[PDB]
Design a protein around this ligand. Structure first.
Ligand SMILES: [Zn+2]
Ligand SMILES: [Zn+2]
Lengths: 180, 1140, 213
């Protein structure tokens, strides 16, 4: 839980942009803003806050480096050439973060659904899927693998797919579908 | 392998900037206005601004300041384009010539650099020794103001403070002092710097001040007398003068942000501040002489003046008259009362000028069905909300103008049987008349024997047998020419007064209540041929004779008052021939029979402002292909009048028009004028074949202009509009709107002011509870803004807000369309929305409502659901092709009356723009460019066909023809993709190449098929093909059309010839300006000919003309390879300027 | 290009009455459209009287006058209804004729003042059509802020409740009264709930009663 080393701008909803843009030539996304309701897990040395190195204290099939083009399957793959010339692909949020990451030594973000609530995501703070973000940047290329980490699992700079310590959690969530 | 043409149909109206000074002459006060690509120069005088010169730049005026360097008699203009095209200009006028000359020019673009936020800053030292340009980060480029820096070469210094906000040199200082505000982690510091041209670097400012206002936004540098710089923040102001530090926080600022300024005094005394929401402030720093040393500033304070337009630019002129350049509203001229009027408003509206932008959406429509589309556009933003109606109009050359406040009808006489030109004009006012004699070209008030003037005339003119006739409330009166005296006077048997009266050379008909008498005109007498009574009171008559007839009408048109009929009576008997019912609650108010091309028509016209017209055949005396249109809101009055060699009507009203037959079909041409109450032809000799018009304030004579220009009609909304559609059956429009409301502990949000949505007839809220599941945002409680979106149904004719359907809290409307689905015969208003919340990065919830304007109000028929925003939808072959976020769904309209998913496409980063031709769908992405989808009938689903492979941040998009797709992105450029024709591979078909690039300089918001020029399309060979209009944030409206390969080279060649002979207003190369340019690449230009250039050809001297066809040739489309002088191009250019 | 009239006598005007004598012909025309009388100035002349009288700076004071004319006539229409001769069916036909008339007599007016409505009032979102302006008056006093509401409502349901079980009730009388309520914008609010709240109740009973029966 930190506090000073967490000062950047929060952007607005997509639609807000869509709106503000039609009235002024000016289009805003060309600023170091982190998309609302999303947090980066990188303190090393919820705007931003420290987190456990990793965690063995529970199940945890790790997530394959996004770059080493490996198959996690239940997930989303976002490519983003930081120089045009090649079409981006994936999901909108994927792309957004992809760029926010690379431009700041940061590689992991967690998006707590708007629904409910330091970081005690476990028994109590459980019951429904969450969104995960792992990012890697070799050259102008950038790739992001995002997936769903059950509501009660922890949150670590370690990229892992968890199972379900709070046997209460869901099966398949809106985000999760389409993921292959 | 693709060719298009692009002309501007309307210069940009939004005002990017404005500056005052002495540019034209040392003794003249000037006002320079930057539109975008245009520069308007005015001159203060008294009532307003006098246009002196208006040039168009080849770039986006990014900076525009003036300076007075000792040596030059007057001021000079520094203008820096957005493509970093710098330059200085002088104003030279030698008689009939006025040139703005380039006294230097270059390009201050560095190949490296990082485009600072806060944009391009352009400043100048009061010592006028050099200019300063904060272009990229940490690099304050400097330019030497030496009288020989014609290339403008400049050096570039370093900055150890990357994030800078505002910068401005400081006055009265031995060495150029540069003050600015910069941000870092520890906050926003505000320091200074000394600059030297020899050492070519910074030395060190006289002071500094580590921690200052959290939200400092403007560095206001004060002149000689006081000195120092003021810092405007978001809630507190601070002034420094080296060793001076004050501060004040008037709660008046708390409300909103200040966004512009202007010093009112040649020395820090009084200033002007612009509020981000309309407010207008006046900040004064009450000076203070010590006791004998010098001047020291005492206390400063901010006091509210009132409300203006949303002031982008701000500039004081004279007598307390401030000019307010709005960018999302109408700019304006204001009076600064020193004597607070009612409601204590120091501000007082003087005058305003049209501002179409930002055009956020628009539809092409032809209400009259005459084959001439008009433009209704959702214009403007917040408070400046509005709709605009762009229509092609006719004008009037205004020969003369009197100041008559009360004309209630006017007629043209003829003093003597000898001369054939009028020489008189009778002007009726309320309880009286007045005869006017045209002494050649003058106006003196005579008197005429036979007539009265203590009564109010209803008619008067030259009847048969050298006699004049005056019908008034009291009686009709006959008079003589040569002898000139009263020679006969009818009258209502019992002193009753005439209510309605008709007349003409030979006959006369007048009404008295229901009583309707008929008189014939003979030698020294008014013979009373007949009399009759109608069931209801009469309200209009017209006995205009027709056919080959000899002045005698067999008929009498008429319109009555409770039954609301409009029949044609046979004269001698008043027998009935044709009785036509119409109206409902509004009566006829003006009528008139007439022959247009050779066909006779009868034209009644309600008090509504409606206008019926039938194909009245004189022979049988009956009418018969009943048509109808609407012209105004006030009861018009028809009046016939002849043109060059043809005849035609003239509908006087709030919206003046001019009926006539263009081709066995009626045509209406709103006259580019405001009100036009009464009118008559005027054939004086001093005024040849003219017209006489009277509004409520003035009588004016003049001839018809007849050179389409564009007329703009505006309907305020006081709340921002986002989309609009046209319902061809409910005769009303669809407009998604949106108002901003504040926070009030009570239970919540209250408005900010009335508006389209809060003040309408019917008005329902959404009772739909599909999201009542939870919905719990914990940021509502303390003052805040919150968009409330409504659907406004608007009346086609009156533009009154009929019904106002509100939406679910925190819900935004963003789609809209009027169509018919499946086998369902109705016609609905289908909306597309999204549930928006700041804590979310995007919407997960949204819906597709389906309405119907049954009558008086809406009625939610269908109501499907979906996860995420519905960025755009559109009627696709009966089916309903909408699109949510990454998804592109197709829907069906069952017999049960429901919409059910039926096909999808998820391969898009964000689908924002749709378009529908056949079974072809053109999709535009936020950044993934365009894609050509397709509906496979049999397959029952989607199939990508092609797609641009270049990353493009689409802004709008359109389908021109089967094979070409037009797109426009945030880069400010246009491009055209085309399905490859190398049908060799089945993969080289997955690609479509950008076969056209052009740099518009405008941020297009909407495109759309439709023209503004009278079409007359049967099979008519046109030089250009297709027609697409497009809206722009800057109010600019433009047009795009396709070309014959054969016409491209000529025009492309011609374009080139012109760029060599034409001086540029900054010595900027047209090839450069129009170069496709993004932060990424910078290709040239292609498949695009900007017609703006190819039109400046008709405005340059004839000598230069030939100096262009100079060896020019031409060969395909037509048989040639030989030269061609001007009179060839002129033909083409001219003939080509007809499509807009 | 300016212009001035030579010898603008500026004389055909010495006395003055053709104003307040026209405002008089209008008060009458109105008070006699209201209170079902017949006027004797026959419509068109009265119309032209407005169109001429109706010129900026004056139109505004005219509107206020035409408004307050009704404003007065309606408040007068209340008194009777504020009685107690209880047959919630007379009370109804009463209020219906009291509406069916105010209707045709605001339609009469509009036609006379057509010029004032479609000139001044129409050029003002601020100001309501003469029509809409009467609806707003017939609302404030009569169907609103009165026992009349809850006496018209409790009486409309009553008519239905009794058709939902074996009596007749004269469709017209209600199609009219309900229409009115609609035209007046108090339907889906001074009648809807109750109606439903009273239906999702009556039928609730029928369920049991009829299941067992
Ligand atoms: Zn999930
Ligand atoms: Zn779990």
């Amino acid at each position: 839980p930190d506090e000073i080393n967490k000062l950047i701008e929060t952007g607005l909803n997509t639609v807000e942009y869509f709106t503000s843009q039609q009235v002024t030539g000016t289009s805003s996304l060309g600023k170091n803003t982190i998309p609302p309701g999303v947090t980066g897990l990188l303190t090393n040395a919820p705007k931003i806050a420290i987190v456990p190195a990793d965690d063995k204290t529970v199940p945890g099939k790790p997530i394959p480096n996004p770059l080493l083009g490996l198959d996690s399957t239940p997930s989303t793959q976002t490519v983003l050439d930081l120089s045009g010339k090649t079409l981006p692909s994936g999901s909108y949020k994927g792309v957004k973060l992809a760029k926010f990451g690379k431009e700041n030594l940061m590689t992991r973000f967690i998006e707590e659904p708007r629904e409910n609530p330091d970081f005690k995501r476990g028994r109590d703070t459980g019951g429904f899927h969450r969104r995960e973000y792992s990012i890697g940047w070799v050259g102008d290329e950038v790739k992001v693998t995002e997936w769903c980490n059950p509501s009660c699992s922890p949150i670590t700079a370690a990229a892992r797919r968890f199972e379900c310590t709070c046997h209460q959690c869901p099966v398949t969530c809106s985000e999760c579908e389409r993921d292959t | 392998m693709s060719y298009n043409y692009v002309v501007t149909a309307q210069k940009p109206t939004a005002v990017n900037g404005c500056v005052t000074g002495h540019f034209t002459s040392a003794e003249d006060l000037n006002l320079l206005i930057a539109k975008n690509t245009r520069l308007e120069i005015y001159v203060v005088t008294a009532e307003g601004l006098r246009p002196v010169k208006e040039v168009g730049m080849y770039g986006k005026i990014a900076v525009m300041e003036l300076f007075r360097p000792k040596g030059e008699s007057k001021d000079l203009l520094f203008i820096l384009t957005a493509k970093y095209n710098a330059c200085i200009l002088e104003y030279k006028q030698s008689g009939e010539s006025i040139d703005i000359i380039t006294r230097a020019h270059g390009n201050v673009q560095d190949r490296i650099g990082r485009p600072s936020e806060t944009g391009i800053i352009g400043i100048i030292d009061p010592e006028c020794r050099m200019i300063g340009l904060r272009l990229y980060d940490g690099l304050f480029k400097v330019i030497p103001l030496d009288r020989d820096n014609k290339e403008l070469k400049a050096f570039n210094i370093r900055l150890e403070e990357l994030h800078v906000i505002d910068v401005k040199f400081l006055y009265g200082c031995q060495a150029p002092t540069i003050c600015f505000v910069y941000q870092d982690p520890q906050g926003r510091h505000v320091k200074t710097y000394e600059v030297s041209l020899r050492e070519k670097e910074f030395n060190k400012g006289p002071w500094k001040q580590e921690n200052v206002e959290a939200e400092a936004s403007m560095v206001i540098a004060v002149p000689e007398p006081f000195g120092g710089a003021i810092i405007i923040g978001q809630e507190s102001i601070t002034y420094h003068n080296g060793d001076k530090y004050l501060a004040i926080a008037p709660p008046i600022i708390k409300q909103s942000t200040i966004v512009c300024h202007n010093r009112v005094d040649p020395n820090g005394s009084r200033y002007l501040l612009g509020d981000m929401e309309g407010r207008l402030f006046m900040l004064l720093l009450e000076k203070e002489e010590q006791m004998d040393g010098t001047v020291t500033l005492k206390d400063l304070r901010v006091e509210l003046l009132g409300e203006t337009s949303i002031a982008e630019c701000l500039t004081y002129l004279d007598n307390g008259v401030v000019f307010v350049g709005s960018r999302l509203g109408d700019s304006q001229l204001v009076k600064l009362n020193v004597d607070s009027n009612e409601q204590g408003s120091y501000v007082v509206a003087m005058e305003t000028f049209t501002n179409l932008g930002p055009i956020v959406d628009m539809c092409v429509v032809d209400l009259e069905r005459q084959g001439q589309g008009q433009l209704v556009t959702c214009s403007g933003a917040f408070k400046e909300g509005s709709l605009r109606i762009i229509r092609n109009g006719i004008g009037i050359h205004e020969h003369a103008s009197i100041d008559l406040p009360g004309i209630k009808g006017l007629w043209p006489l003829r003093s003597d049987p000898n001369r054939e030109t009028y020489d008189t004009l009778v002007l009726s006012f309320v309880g009286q008349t007045r005869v006017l004699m045209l002494n050649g070209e003058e106006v003196e008030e005579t008197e005429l024997m036979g007539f009265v003037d203590d009564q109010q005339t209803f008619f008067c003119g030259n009847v048969a047998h050298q006699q004049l006739i005056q019908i008034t409330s009291a009686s009709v009166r006959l008079v003589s020419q040569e002898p000139k005296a009263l020679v006969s006077e009818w009258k209502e048997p019992q002193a009753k007064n005439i209510s309605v009266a008709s007349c003409n050379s030979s006959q006369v008909v007048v009404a008295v209540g229901r009583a309707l008498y008929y008189l014939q005109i003979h030698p020294q007498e008014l013979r009373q041929i007949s009399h009759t009574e109608m069931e209801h009171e009469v309200a209009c008559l017209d006995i205009t004779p027709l056919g080959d007839s000899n002045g005698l009408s067999p008929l009498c048109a008429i319109g009555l008052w409770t039954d609301i009929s409009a029949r044609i009576l046979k004269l001698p008997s008043f027998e009935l021939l044709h009785k036509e019912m119409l109206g409902g609650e509004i009566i006829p108010r003006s009528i008139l029979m007439t022959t247009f091309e050779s066909s006779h028509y009868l034209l009644c016209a309600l008090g509504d402002g409606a206008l019926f017209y039938f194909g009245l055949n004189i022979e049988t005396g009956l009418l018969s292909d009943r048509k109808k249109v609407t012209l105004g809101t006030q009861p018009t009055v028809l009046r016939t009048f002849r043109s060059l060699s043809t005849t035609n009507v003239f509908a006087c009203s709030d919206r003046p028009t001019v009926i006539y037959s263009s081709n066995h079909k009626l045509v209406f041409s709103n006259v580019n004028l405001k009100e036009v109450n009464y009118m008559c032809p005027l054939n004086s000799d001093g005024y040849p074949d003219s017209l006489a018009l009277a509004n409520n304030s003035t009588l004016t004579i003049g001839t018809i202009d007849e050179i389409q220009k564009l007329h703009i009609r505006t309907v305020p909304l006081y709340e921002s509009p986002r989309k609009i559609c046209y319902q061809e059956v409910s005769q009303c429009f669809g407009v998604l709107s949106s108002r901003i409301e504040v926070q009030d502990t009570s239970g919540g949000t209250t408005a900010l002011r009335p508006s389209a949505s809060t003040q309408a007839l019917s008005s329902s809220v959404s009772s739909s509870k599909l999201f009542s599941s939870s919905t719990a945002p914990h940021e509502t409680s303390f003052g805040e803004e919150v968009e409330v979106h409504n659907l406004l149904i608007i009346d086609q004719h009156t533009f009154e807000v009929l019904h106002a359907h509100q939406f679910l809290q925190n819900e935004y409307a963003l789609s809209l369309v009027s169509c018919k689905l499946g086998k369902d015969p109705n016609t609905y208003f289908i909306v597309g929305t999204a549930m928006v919340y700041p804590e979310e990065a995007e919407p997960k919830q949204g819906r597709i409502v389906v309405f119907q304007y049954s009558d008086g109000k809406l009625q939610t028929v269908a109501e499907k659901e979906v996860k995420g925003a519905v960025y755009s939808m559109v009627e696709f072959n009966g089916k309903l092709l909408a699109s949510i976020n990454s998804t592109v769904r197709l829907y069906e309209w069952t017999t049960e009356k429901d919409v059910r998913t039926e096909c999808n496409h998820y391969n898009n980063i964000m689908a924002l723009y749709l378009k529908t031709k056949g079974d072809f769908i053109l999709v535009g992405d936020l950044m993934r460019s365009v894609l050509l989808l397709a509906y496979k009938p049999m397959e029952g689903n989607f199939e990508e066909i092609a797609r641009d492979f270049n990353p493009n941040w689409m802004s709008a998009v359109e389908i021109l023809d089967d094979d070409n797709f037009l797109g426009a992105e945030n880069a400010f450029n246009l491009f055209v993709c085309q399905k490859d024709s190398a049908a060799t591979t089945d993969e080289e078909r997955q690609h479509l190449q950008e076969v056209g690039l052009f740099h518009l300089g405008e941020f297009v918001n909407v495109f759309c098929h439709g023209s503004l020029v009278m079409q007359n399309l049967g099979e008519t060979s046109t030089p250009t093909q297709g027609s697409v209009l497009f809206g722009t944030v800057n109010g600019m409206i433009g047009l795009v059309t396709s070309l014959s390969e054969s016409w491209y080279n000529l025009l492309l060649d011609m374009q080139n010839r012109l760029n060599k002979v034409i001086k540029s207003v900054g010595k900027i190369e047209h090839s450069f300006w129009r170069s496709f340019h993004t932060e990424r690449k910078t290709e040239p230009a292609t498949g695009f000919i900007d017609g703006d250039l190819i039109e400046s050809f008709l405005d340059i001297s004839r000598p230069k003309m030939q100096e262009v066809v100079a060896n020019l040739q031409y060969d395909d489309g037509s048989g040639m390879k030989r030269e061609a002088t001007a009179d060839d191009l002129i033909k083409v250019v001219e003939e080509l300027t007809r499509i807009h | 290009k300016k212009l001035v009239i030579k010898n603008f006598r500026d004389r055909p005007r010495l006395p003055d009455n053709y104003t307040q004598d026209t405002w008089r012909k209008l008060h009458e025309a109105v008070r006699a459209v209201q209170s079902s009388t017949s006027i004797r100035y026959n419509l068109e002349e009265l119309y032209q009287a407005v169109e001429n009288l109706c010129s900026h700076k004056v139109s505004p004071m005219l509107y206020k006058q035409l408004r307050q004319a009704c404003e007065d006539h309606v408040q007068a229409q209340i008194l009777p209804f504020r009685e107690d001769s209880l047959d919630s069916v007379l009370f109804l036909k009463k209020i219906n004729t009291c509406w069916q008339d105010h209707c045709r007599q605001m339609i009469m007016i509009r036609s006379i003042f057509l010029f004032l409505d479609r000139t001044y009032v129409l050029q003002n979102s601020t100001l309501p059509s003469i029509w809409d302006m009467g609806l707003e008056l017939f609302r404030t006093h009569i169907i609103s802020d009165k026992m009349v509401q809850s006496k018209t409502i409790d009486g409309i349901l009553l008519l239905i409740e009794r058709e939902r079980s074996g009596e007749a009730v004269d469709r017209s009388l209600l199609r009219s009264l309900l229409g009115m309520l609609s035209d007046l914008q108090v339907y889906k609010d001074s009648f809807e709930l109750k109606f439903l709240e009273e239906t999702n109740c009556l039928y609730a009973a029928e369920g049991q009663r009829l299941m067992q029966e």
